Amino acid sequence: XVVXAX
Amino acid sequence: AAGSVPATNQLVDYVVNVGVGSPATTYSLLVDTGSSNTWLGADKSYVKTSTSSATSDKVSVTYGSGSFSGTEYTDTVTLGSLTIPKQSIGVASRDSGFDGVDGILGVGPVDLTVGTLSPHTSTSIPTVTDNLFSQGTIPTNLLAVSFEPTTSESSTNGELTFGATDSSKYTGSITYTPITSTSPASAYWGINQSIRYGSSTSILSSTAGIVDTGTTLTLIASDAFAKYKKATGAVADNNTGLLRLTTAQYANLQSLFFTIGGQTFELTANAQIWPRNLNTAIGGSASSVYLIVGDLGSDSGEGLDFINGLTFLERFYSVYDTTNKRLGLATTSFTTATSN
């Protein structure tokens, strides 16, 4: 898997 | 006083139990220093009790690997022995990317919340850490996070401490660095660092990026990822979406050295690989080496050129100091583990 507030 | 809560390693993320309401329902929320909205509703329905109150706003957040939208409420939130009356939370009616969790515990800097509410698009949402401090419960506005490597699918081997550090979770001393002045990393828990491979190979020249418990991989700018693939001999792998090494290339894998705050942090060869007894969790095969260094998907020079994620933080204790606007890092008894 995850990539958390691009 | 300061207080801690255990956290559980779910391989791709960590979660903590969070009570909401009175009487409290427990939700398992993903620990995220890369976003700042606390929300629930991805699994269990929101149980409304007498401490729930409506606000005038809807809420929406977009993430790298998902999104949610819904309605903002206030409610009583419990973290271990700490209670926050009137914490503003989101309650999702839509969500994607949240398998395995109820939502997020948003412990990024409050500035990330500006723009998430509608119609109040300029209004910020004080975070759990901010509220614990302004209500007088914790003695300084800080969060310290302990992650550890894992060889099980779900291991409660982590800790959040609000308002203090826990010296049982780190070795040596903590090195601090100011939050970077470079945007957009400066909106997050953003720092400046460089990365080298072994003694003589630059990977990422000094630049800005972020420390994010809610990104799984240790992500680096695309040009740095190409240098890392060349230096290690790694190739792309179908079944996982991770880089793969042969047996020989793993035997020859050198450390990555991160320079942060004037100190060297050594991410060892074993720390660079996915836990091999859990290779099936990522679609891999047994007795195979897959790497947790990944491609950020953008080139360096954009003001946010790396993410030191969960896989990095399994090896380093981290301190998210709002009062001083700084980030601390320390080794742990697991920095040199070989359990992967």
Side-chain angles (χ1 to χ4, degrees), chain B residues 216-279:
Chain B
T216 308
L217 298 188
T218 297
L219 297 179
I220 61 179
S222 303
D223 48 314
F225 188 72
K227 290 179 190 179
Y228 179 74
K229 278 188 77 178
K230 179 186 171 175
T232 61
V235 301
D237 180 76
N238 180 84
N239 289 9
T240 66
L242 298 183
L243 288 173
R244 186 182 166 118
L245 295 183
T246 64
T247 289
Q249 286 168 341
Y250 177 66
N252 287 307
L253 185 61
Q254 315 290 283
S255 297
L256 288 166
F257 298 94
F258 289 73
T259 300
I260 301 170
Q263 293 298 153
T264 293
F265 294 89
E266 182 177 351
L267 191 73
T268 62
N270 190 255
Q272 286 170 64
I273 81 176
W274 182 271
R276 287 173 285 191
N277 76 303
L278 302 171
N279 280 346

Short mmCIF file of all heavy atoms in Angstrom, two decimals, chain B residues 216-279:
data_model
loop_
_atom_site.label_atom_id
_atom_site.label_comp_id
_atom_site.label_asym_id
_atom_site.label_seq_id
_atom_site.Cartn_x
_atom_site.Cartn_y
_atom_site.Cartn_z
N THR B 216 4.11 0.48 2.38
CA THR B 216 4.75 -0.79 2.71
C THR B 216 6.24 -0.75 2.39
O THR B 216 7.11 -1.06 3.22
CB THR B 216 4.12 -1.95 1.95
OG1 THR B 216 2.70 -1.92 2.12
CG2 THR B 216 4.65 -3.29 2.44
N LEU B 217 6.56 -0.47 1.14
CA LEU B 217 7.90 -0.58 0.61
C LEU B 217 8.76 0.63 0.98
O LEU B 217 8.26 1.65 1.45
CB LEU B 217 7.82 -0.73 -0.94
CG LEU B 217 7.07 -1.97 -1.42
CD1 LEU B 217 7.22 -2.11 -2.93
CD2 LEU B 217 7.52 -3.29 -0.75
N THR B 218 10.07 0.46 0.81
CA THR B 218 10.99 1.56 0.89
C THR B 218 11.13 2.10 -0.53
O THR B 218 11.81 1.41 -1.39
CB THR B 218 12.28 1.08 1.53
OG1 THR B 218 11.98 0.67 2.88
CG2 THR B 218 13.36 2.16 1.62
N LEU B 219 10.43 3.15 -0.86
CA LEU B 219 10.33 3.61 -2.24
C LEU B 219 11.32 4.71 -2.52
O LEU B 219 11.52 5.64 -1.70
CB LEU B 219 8.91 4.13 -2.53
CG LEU B 219 7.77 3.11 -2.42
CD1 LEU B 219 6.42 3.82 -2.71
CD2 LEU B 219 8.01 1.96 -3.38
N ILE B 220 11.93 4.64 -3.69
CA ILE B 220 12.92 5.65 -4.12
C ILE B 220 12.64 6.11 -5.52
O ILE B 220 12.06 5.37 -6.33
CB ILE B 220 14.39 5.10 -3.95
CG1 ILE B 220 14.61 3.83 -4.83
CG2 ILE B 220 14.64 4.81 -2.49
CD1 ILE B 220 16.02 3.27 -4.71
N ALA B 221 13.01 7.35 -5.80
CA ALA B 221 12.78 7.94 -7.12
C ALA B 221 13.25 7.03 -8.25
O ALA B 221 14.19 6.28 -8.06
CB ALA B 221 13.49 9.29 -7.23
N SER B 222 12.60 7.13 -9.39
CA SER B 222 12.85 6.16 -10.47
C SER B 222 14.26 6.08 -10.94
O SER B 222 14.74 5.00 -11.25
CB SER B 222 11.90 6.53 -11.67
OG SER B 222 10.55 6.54 -11.25
N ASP B 223 14.95 7.23 -11.02
CA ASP B 223 16.34 7.20 -11.39
C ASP B 223 17.22 6.53 -10.37
O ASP B 223 18.20 5.82 -10.69
CB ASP B 223 16.85 8.65 -11.70
CG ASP B 223 16.47 9.68 -10.66
OD1 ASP B 223 15.33 9.77 -10.18
OD2 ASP B 223 17.34 10.51 -10.25
N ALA B 224 16.88 6.65 -9.06
CA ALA B 224 17.58 5.94 -8.00
C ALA B 224 17.25 4.47 -8.01
O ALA B 224 18.15 3.63 -7.81
CB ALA B 224 17.12 6.56 -6.67
N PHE B 225 15.99 4.11 -8.31
CA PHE B 225 15.62 2.70 -8.44
C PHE B 225 16.37 2.04 -9.54
O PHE B 225 16.85 0.90 -9.41
CB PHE B 225 14.09 2.62 -8.72
CG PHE B 225 13.56 1.23 -8.70
CD1 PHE B 225 13.44 0.51 -7.52
CD2 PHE B 225 13.18 0.64 -9.92
CE1 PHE B 225 12.91 -0.75 -7.52
CE2 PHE B 225 12.66 -0.65 -9.87
CZ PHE B 225 12.49 -1.34 -8.69
N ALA B 226 16.60 2.71 -10.71
CA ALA B 226 17.44 2.11 -11.75
C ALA B 226 18.81 1.88 -11.28
O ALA B 226 19.43 0.85 -11.59
CB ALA B 226 17.42 3.08 -12.96
N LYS B 227 19.41 2.80 -10.51
CA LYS B 227 20.79 2.61 -9.96
C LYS B 227 20.81 1.41 -9.02
O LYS B 227 21.79 0.63 -9.00
CB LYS B 227 21.26 3.84 -9.21
CG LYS B 227 21.54 5.00 -10.20
CD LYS B 227 22.01 6.26 -9.38
CE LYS B 227 22.02 7.43 -10.38
NZ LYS B 227 22.46 8.66 -9.64
N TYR B 228 19.76 1.26 -8.19
CA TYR B 228 19.70 0.13 -7.24
C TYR B 228 19.57 -1.21 -7.97
O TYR B 228 20.22 -2.20 -7.59
CB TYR B 228 18.52 0.38 -6.34
CG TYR B 228 18.29 -0.71 -5.31
CD1 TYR B 228 19.15 -0.81 -4.20
CD2 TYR B 228 17.28 -1.65 -5.44
CE1 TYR B 228 18.95 -1.80 -3.22
CE2 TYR B 228 17.09 -2.63 -4.47
CZ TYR B 228 17.88 -2.68 -3.39
OH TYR B 228 17.66 -3.69 -2.46
N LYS B 229 18.72 -1.26 -8.99
CA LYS B 229 18.59 -2.50 -9.77
C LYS B 229 19.90 -2.81 -10.41
O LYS B 229 20.36 -4.01 -10.39
CB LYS B 229 17.57 -2.28 -10.91
CG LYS B 229 16.32 -2.39 -10.63
CD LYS B 229 15.34 -2.34 -11.82
CE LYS B 229 15.29 -3.65 -12.62
NZ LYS B 229 14.30 -3.69 -13.78
N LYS B 230 20.66 -1.86 -10.96
CA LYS B 230 21.96 -2.14 -11.56
C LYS B 230 22.89 -2.63 -10.52
O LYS B 230 23.66 -3.62 -10.77
CB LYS B 230 22.47 -0.81 -12.22
CG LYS B 230 23.83 -0.96 -12.86
CD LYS B 230 24.33 0.47 -13.36
CE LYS B 230 25.82 0.29 -13.79
NZ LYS B 230 26.40 1.60 -14.42
N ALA B 231 22.98 -2.01 -9.34
CA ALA B 231 24.01 -2.31 -8.33
C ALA B 231 23.74 -3.69 -7.73
O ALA B 231 24.77 -4.40 -7.40
CB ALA B 231 23.90 -1.28 -7.22
N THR B 232 22.51 -4.12 -7.60
CA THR B 232 22.20 -5.41 -6.95
C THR B 232 22.11 -6.53 -7.94
O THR B 232 22.19 -7.70 -7.50
CB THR B 232 20.85 -5.32 -6.22
OG1 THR B 232 19.79 -5.03 -7.16
CG2 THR B 232 20.80 -4.29 -5.08
N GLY B 233 21.93 -6.26 -9.22
CA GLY B 233 21.67 -7.28 -10.21
C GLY B 233 20.23 -7.69 -10.25
O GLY B 233 19.82 -8.63 -11.02
N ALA B 234 19.32 -7.04 -9.49
CA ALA B 234 17.97 -7.47 -9.45
C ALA B 234 17.20 -7.35 -10.76
O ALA B 234 17.54 -6.45 -11.56
CB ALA B 234 17.21 -6.66 -8.37
N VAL B 235 16.22 -8.17 -10.94
CA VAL B 235 15.33 -8.12 -12.14
C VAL B 235 13.93 -8.05 -11.64
O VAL B 235 13.53 -8.46 -10.54
CB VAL B 235 15.60 -9.31 -13.03
CG1 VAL B 235 17.07 -9.34 -13.50
CG2 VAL B 235 15.16 -10.58 -12.49
N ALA B 236 13.00 -7.56 -12.51
CA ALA B 236 11.59 -7.57 -12.23
C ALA B 236 11.04 -8.90 -12.13
O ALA B 236 11.53 -9.95 -12.76
CB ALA B 236 10.83 -6.85 -13.50
N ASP B 237 10.07 -9.15 -11.27
CA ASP B 237 9.40 -10.40 -11.11
C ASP B 237 7.84 -10.31 -11.35
O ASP B 237 7.19 -9.57 -10.51
CB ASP B 237 9.71 -10.99 -9.72
CG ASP B 237 9.05 -12.26 -9.54
OD1 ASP B 237 9.54 -13.30 -10.14
OD2 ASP B 237 8.06 -12.41 -8.82
N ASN B 238 7.28 -11.27 -12.19
CA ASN B 238 5.81 -11.28 -12.49
C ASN B 238 5.06 -11.50 -11.32
O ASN B 238 3.96 -10.82 -11.05
CB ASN B 238 5.47 -12.35 -13.65
CG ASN B 238 3.98 -12.42 -14.00
OD1 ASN B 238 3.49 -11.62 -14.81
ND2 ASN B 238 3.23 -13.34 -13.32
N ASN B 239 5.14 -12.62 -10.64
CA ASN B 239 4.20 -13.21 -9.76
C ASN B 239 4.08 -12.18 -8.51
O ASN B 239 3.00 -12.17 -7.84
CB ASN B 239 4.59 -14.57 -9.31
CG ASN B 239 4.49 -15.66 -10.37
OD1 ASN B 239 4.28 -15.33 -11.47
ND2 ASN B 239 4.65 -16.87 -9.99
N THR B 240 5.14 -11.32 -8.20
CA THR B 240 5.12 -10.48 -7.00
C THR B 240 4.99 -9.02 -7.21
O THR B 240 4.59 -8.35 -6.25
CB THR B 240 6.40 -10.78 -6.18
OG1 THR B 240 7.54 -10.35 -6.93
CG2 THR B 240 6.56 -12.25 -5.77
N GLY B 241 5.45 -8.46 -8.31
CA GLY B 241 5.62 -7.06 -8.40
C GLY B 241 6.77 -6.45 -7.61
O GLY B 241 6.94 -5.24 -7.49
N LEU B 242 7.65 -7.38 -7.12
CA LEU B 242 8.91 -6.96 -6.39
C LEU B 242 10.08 -7.28 -7.23
O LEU B 242 10.05 -8.25 -8.10
CB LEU B 242 8.95 -7.66 -5.07
CG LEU B 242 7.79 -7.34 -4.08
CD1 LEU B 242 8.00 -8.05 -2.78
CD2 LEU B 242 7.67 -5.82 -3.84
N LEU B 243 11.21 -6.68 -7.00
CA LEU B 243 12.48 -7.14 -7.60
C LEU B 243 12.85 -8.47 -7.02
O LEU B 243 12.51 -8.78 -5.88
CB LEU B 243 13.55 -6.15 -7.24
CG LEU B 243 13.50 -4.79 -7.95
CD1 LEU B 243 14.55 -3.83 -7.37
CD2 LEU B 243 13.65 -4.91 -9.46
N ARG B 244 13.55 -9.29 -7.78
CA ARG B 244 14.03 -10.59 -7.34
C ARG B 244 15.54 -10.69 -7.54
O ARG B 244 16.09 -10.20 -8.50
CB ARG B 244 13.35 -11.74 -8.07
CG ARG B 244 13.67 -13.14 -7.59
CD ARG B 244 12.98 -14.35 -8.41
NE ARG B 244 13.68 -15.70 -8.02
CZ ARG B 244 13.10 -16.70 -7.46
NH1 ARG B 244 11.75 -16.82 -7.23
NH2 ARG B 244 13.86 -17.68 -6.99
N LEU B 245 16.19 -11.38 -6.58
CA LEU B 245 17.61 -11.72 -6.66
C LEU B 245 17.73 -13.27 -6.71
O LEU B 245 17.00 -13.97 -6.12
CB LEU B 245 18.35 -11.26 -5.36
CG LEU B 245 18.38 -9.76 -5.13
CD1 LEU B 245 19.21 -9.49 -3.86
CD2 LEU B 245 19.00 -9.05 -6.34
N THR B 246 18.81 -13.67 -7.42
CA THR B 246 19.24 -15.08 -7.29
C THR B 246 19.90 -15.31 -5.94
O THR B 246 20.23 -14.40 -5.18
CB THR B 246 20.29 -15.40 -8.37
OG1 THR B 246 21.46 -14.60 -8.16
CG2 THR B 246 19.74 -15.15 -9.80
N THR B 247 20.15 -16.60 -5.66
CA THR B 247 20.87 -16.98 -4.45
C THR B 247 22.23 -16.28 -4.38
O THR B 247 22.58 -15.69 -3.33
CB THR B 247 21.07 -18.54 -4.51
OG1 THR B 247 19.79 -19.09 -4.30
CG2 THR B 247 21.99 -19.03 -3.38
N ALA B 248 22.99 -16.28 -5.43
CA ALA B 248 24.26 -15.65 -5.42
C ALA B 248 24.17 -14.16 -5.22
O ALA B 248 24.95 -13.50 -4.54
CB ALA B 248 25.03 -15.95 -6.74
N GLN B 249 23.18 -13.51 -5.91
CA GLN B 249 23.06 -12.07 -5.78
C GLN B 249 22.62 -11.68 -4.32
O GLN B 249 23.10 -10.66 -3.86
CB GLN B 249 21.97 -11.55 -6.76
CG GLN B 249 22.53 -11.59 -8.22
CD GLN B 249 21.37 -11.37 -9.21
OE1 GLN B 249 20.21 -11.54 -8.92
NE2 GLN B 249 21.78 -10.91 -10.42
N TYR B 250 21.82 -12.49 -3.68
CA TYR B 250 21.50 -12.20 -2.26
C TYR B 250 22.74 -12.35 -1.39
O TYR B 250 23.01 -11.51 -0.55
CB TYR B 250 20.36 -13.06 -1.75
CG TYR B 250 20.11 -12.77 -0.27
CD1 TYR B 250 19.63 -11.52 0.15
CD2 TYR B 250 20.44 -13.69 0.73
CE1 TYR B 250 19.48 -11.19 1.48
CE2 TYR B 250 20.26 -13.40 2.08
CZ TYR B 250 19.79 -12.12 2.43
OH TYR B 250 19.65 -11.82 3.75
N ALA B 251 23.54 -13.41 -1.66
CA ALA B 251 24.77 -13.57 -0.88
C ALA B 251 25.69 -12.37 -0.99
O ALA B 251 26.38 -11.99 -0.06
CB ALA B 251 25.48 -14.82 -1.30
N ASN B 252 25.70 -11.71 -2.16
CA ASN B 252 26.49 -10.53 -2.44
C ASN B 252 25.82 -9.22 -2.18
O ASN B 252 26.41 -8.14 -2.40
CB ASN B 252 26.97 -10.60 -3.92
CG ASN B 252 28.05 -11.62 -4.09
OD1 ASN B 252 29.06 -11.62 -3.40
ND2 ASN B 252 27.77 -12.54 -4.97
N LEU B 253 24.58 -9.23 -1.71
CA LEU B 253 23.83 -7.98 -1.46
C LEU B 253 24.47 -7.18 -0.35
O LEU B 253 24.71 -7.72 0.74
CB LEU B 253 22.38 -8.32 -1.13
CG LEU B 253 21.42 -7.12 -0.95
CD1 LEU B 253 21.30 -6.26 -2.18
CD2 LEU B 253 20.03 -7.61 -0.50
N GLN B 254 24.77 -5.93 -0.62
CA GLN B 254 25.35 -5.02 0.40
C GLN B 254 24.26 -4.20 1.08
O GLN B 254 23.12 -4.12 0.60
CB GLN B 254 26.35 -4.08 -0.30
CG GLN B 254 27.36 -4.64 -1.32
CD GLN B 254 28.21 -5.38 -0.48
OE1 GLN B 254 29.15 -4.89 0.29
NE2 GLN B 254 28.24 -6.68 -0.65
N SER B 255 24.64 -3.57 2.20
CA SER B 255 23.73 -2.64 2.89
C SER B 255 23.44 -1.41 2.09
O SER B 255 24.28 -0.95 1.27
CB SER B 255 24.28 -2.24 4.23
OG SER B 255 24.38 -3.40 5.07
N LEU B 256 22.28 -0.84 2.31
CA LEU B 256 22.00 0.54 1.95
C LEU B 256 22.27 1.43 3.14
O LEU B 256 21.86 1.11 4.29
CB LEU B 256 20.55 0.73 1.53
CG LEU B 256 20.16 0.17 0.21
CD1 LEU B 256 18.63 0.10 0.01
CD2 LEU B 256 20.78 0.97 -0.96
N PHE B 257 22.99 2.50 2.93
CA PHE B 257 23.35 3.44 4.01
C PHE B 257 22.60 4.72 3.81
O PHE B 257 22.80 5.38 2.74
CB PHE B 257 24.87 3.67 4.03
CG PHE B 257 25.67 2.41 4.31
CD1 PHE B 257 26.17 1.62 3.28
CD2 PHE B 257 25.95 2.04 5.61
CE1 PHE B 257 26.92 0.47 3.58
CE2 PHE B 257 26.73 0.93 5.88
CZ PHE B 257 27.19 0.15 4.90
N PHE B 258 21.76 5.08 4.74
CA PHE B 258 20.94 6.32 4.68
C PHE B 258 21.65 7.33 5.57
O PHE B 258 21.91 7.09 6.75
CB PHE B 258 19.56 6.03 5.28
CG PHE B 258 18.72 5.13 4.39
CD1 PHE B 258 18.99 3.76 4.25
CD2 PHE B 258 17.58 5.63 3.76
CE1 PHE B 258 18.20 2.96 3.46
CE2 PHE B 258 16.80 4.83 2.97
CZ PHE B 258 17.10 3.48 2.81
N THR B 259 21.91 8.50 5.04
CA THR B 259 22.49 9.61 5.84
C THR B 259 21.37 10.54 6.19
O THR B 259 20.75 11.13 5.31
CB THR B 259 23.56 10.34 5.09
OG1 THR B 259 24.63 9.42 4.73
CG2 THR B 259 24.18 11.48 5.94
N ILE B 260 21.10 10.63 7.51
CA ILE B 260 19.96 11.44 8.04
C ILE B 260 20.46 12.13 9.28
O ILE B 260 21.01 11.52 10.20
CB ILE B 260 18.78 10.51 8.43
CG1 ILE B 260 18.30 9.70 7.24
CG2 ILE B 260 17.67 11.35 9.07
CD1 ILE B 260 17.31 8.59 7.61
N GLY B 261 20.31 13.47 9.34
CA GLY B 261 20.71 14.19 10.54
C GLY B 261 22.20 14.09 10.85
O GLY B 261 22.55 14.19 12.04
N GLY B 262 23.03 13.85 9.83
CA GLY B 262 24.48 13.73 10.04
C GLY B 262 24.90 12.36 10.49
O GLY B 262 26.12 12.15 10.74
N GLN B 263 23.99 11.39 10.60
CA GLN B 263 24.31 10.04 11.04
C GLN B 263 24.00 9.02 9.95
O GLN B 263 23.13 9.26 9.07
CB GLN B 263 23.59 9.70 12.27
CG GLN B 263 24.04 10.56 13.49
CD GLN B 263 25.51 10.43 13.93
OE1 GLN B 263 25.98 11.53 14.56
NE2 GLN B 263 26.13 9.41 13.77
N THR B 264 24.71 7.95 9.97
CA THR B 264 24.47 6.80 9.05
C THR B 264 23.55 5.80 9.68
O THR B 264 23.76 5.34 10.83
CB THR B 264 25.80 6.04 8.85
OG1 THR B 264 26.75 6.84 8.12
CG2 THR B 264 25.62 4.78 7.96
N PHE B 265 22.50 5.41 8.95
CA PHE B 265 21.58 4.31 9.30
C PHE B 265 21.75 3.21 8.30
O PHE B 265 21.60 3.47 7.05
CB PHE B 265 20.16 4.84 9.35
CG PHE B 265 19.96 5.84 10.49
CD1 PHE B 265 20.20 7.20 10.26
CD2 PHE B 265 19.69 5.39 11.76
CE1 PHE B 265 20.08 8.07 11.33
CE2 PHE B 265 19.54 6.30 12.82
CZ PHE B 265 19.75 7.64 12.60
N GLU B 266 22.02 2.00 8.72
CA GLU B 266 22.37 0.90 7.83
C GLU B 266 21.21 -0.06 7.68
O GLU B 266 20.83 -0.78 8.65
CB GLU B 266 23.58 0.20 8.40
CG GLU B 266 24.05 -0.96 7.47
CD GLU B 266 25.27 -1.65 7.90
OE1 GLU B 266 26.01 -1.20 8.88
OE2 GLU B 266 25.66 -2.66 7.27
N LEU B 267 20.60 -0.07 6.50
CA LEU B 267 19.54 -1.04 6.14
C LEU B 267 20.25 -2.25 5.51
O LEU B 267 20.75 -2.23 4.37
CB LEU B 267 18.56 -0.38 5.18
CG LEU B 267 17.27 -1.17 4.94
CD1 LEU B 267 16.33 -1.11 6.15
CD2 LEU B 267 16.55 -0.65 3.70
N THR B 268 20.34 -3.32 6.30
CA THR B 268 21.19 -4.46 5.89
C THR B 268 20.57 -5.23 4.75
O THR B 268 19.40 -5.03 4.38
CB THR B 268 21.39 -5.41 7.09
OG1 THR B 268 20.07 -5.92 7.45
CG2 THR B 268 22.03 -4.73 8.30
N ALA B 269 21.37 -6.15 4.19
CA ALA B 269 20.86 -7.04 3.15
C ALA B 269 19.60 -7.74 3.59
O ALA B 269 18.58 -7.74 2.83
CB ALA B 269 21.93 -8.08 2.79
N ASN B 270 19.55 -8.29 4.79
CA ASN B 270 18.36 -9.02 5.19
C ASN B 270 17.13 -8.06 5.31
O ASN B 270 15.99 -8.44 5.02
CB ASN B 270 18.55 -9.75 6.52
CG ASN B 270 17.41 -10.69 6.81
OD1 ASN B 270 16.55 -10.43 7.65
ND2 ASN B 270 17.43 -11.87 6.14
N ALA B 271 17.41 -6.83 5.78
CA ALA B 271 16.33 -5.83 5.90
C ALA B 271 15.78 -5.43 4.55
O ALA B 271 14.67 -4.85 4.48
CB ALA B 271 16.88 -4.58 6.59
N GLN B 272 16.51 -5.66 3.45
CA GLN B 272 16.07 -5.28 2.10
C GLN B 272 15.19 -6.30 1.45
O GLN B 272 14.74 -6.07 0.33
CB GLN B 272 17.30 -5.03 1.21
CG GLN B 272 18.01 -3.70 1.55
CD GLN B 272 19.32 -3.60 0.82
OE1 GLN B 272 19.37 -3.56 -0.42
NE2 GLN B 272 20.40 -3.60 1.55
N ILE B 273 14.92 -7.43 2.12
CA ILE B 273 14.13 -8.52 1.50
C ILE B 273 12.84 -8.74 2.24
O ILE B 273 12.72 -8.48 3.45
CB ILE B 273 14.95 -9.84 1.32
CG1 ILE B 273 15.00 -10.66 2.62
CG2 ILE B 273 16.32 -9.51 0.74
CD1 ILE B 273 15.70 -12.00 2.45
N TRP B 274 11.81 -9.23 1.50
CA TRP B 274 10.55 -9.63 2.08
C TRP B 274 10.75 -10.88 2.96
O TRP B 274 11.60 -11.73 2.56
CB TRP B 274 9.54 -9.90 0.95
CG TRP B 274 8.17 -10.27 1.38
CD1 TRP B 274 7.69 -11.49 1.62
CD2 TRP B 274 7.10 -9.34 1.68
NE1 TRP B 274 6.37 -11.44 2.08
CE2 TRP B 274 6.02 -10.13 2.12
CE3 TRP B 274 6.97 -7.96 1.68
CZ2 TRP B 274 4.75 -9.56 2.55
CZ3 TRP B 274 5.74 -7.38 2.01
CH2 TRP B 274 4.68 -8.16 2.50
N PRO B 275 10.08 -11.04 4.06
CA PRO B 275 10.25 -12.27 4.88
C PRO B 275 9.95 -13.52 4.07
O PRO B 275 8.81 -13.75 3.64
CB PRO B 275 9.26 -12.06 6.03
CG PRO B 275 8.28 -11.00 5.59
CD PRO B 275 9.13 -10.11 4.70
N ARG B 276 10.99 -14.34 3.85
CA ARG B 276 10.86 -15.42 2.89
C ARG B 276 9.87 -16.52 3.31
O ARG B 276 9.22 -17.10 2.40
CB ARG B 276 12.21 -16.04 2.61
CG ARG B 276 13.08 -15.11 1.76
CD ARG B 276 14.50 -15.59 1.59
NE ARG B 276 15.27 -15.37 2.84
CZ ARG B 276 16.60 -15.51 2.91
NH1 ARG B 276 17.30 -15.99 1.88
NH2 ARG B 276 17.25 -15.13 4.00
N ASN B 277 9.65 -16.69 4.58
CA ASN B 277 8.64 -17.70 4.99
C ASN B 277 7.31 -17.22 4.69
O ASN B 277 6.33 -18.04 4.75
CB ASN B 277 8.81 -18.10 6.46
CG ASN B 277 8.35 -17.12 7.42
OD1 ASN B 277 8.77 -15.92 7.46
ND2 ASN B 277 7.35 -17.44 8.27
N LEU B 278 7.07 -15.95 4.33
CA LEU B 278 5.82 -15.31 3.96
C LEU B 278 5.77 -14.91 2.54
O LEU B 278 5.00 -14.05 2.12
CB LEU B 278 5.57 -14.14 4.93
CG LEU B 278 5.49 -14.50 6.39
CD1 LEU B 278 5.46 -13.18 7.27
CD2 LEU B 278 4.22 -15.35 6.65
N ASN B 279 6.64 -15.51 1.67
CA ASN B 279 6.64 -15.16 0.28
C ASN B 279 5.26 -15.36 -0.43
O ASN B 279 4.93 -14.67 -1.35
CB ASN B 279 7.72 -15.93 -0.52
CG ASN B 279 9.08 -15.37 -0.39
OD1 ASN B 279 9.28 -14.23 0.09
ND2 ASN B 279 10.11 -16.13 -0.80
#
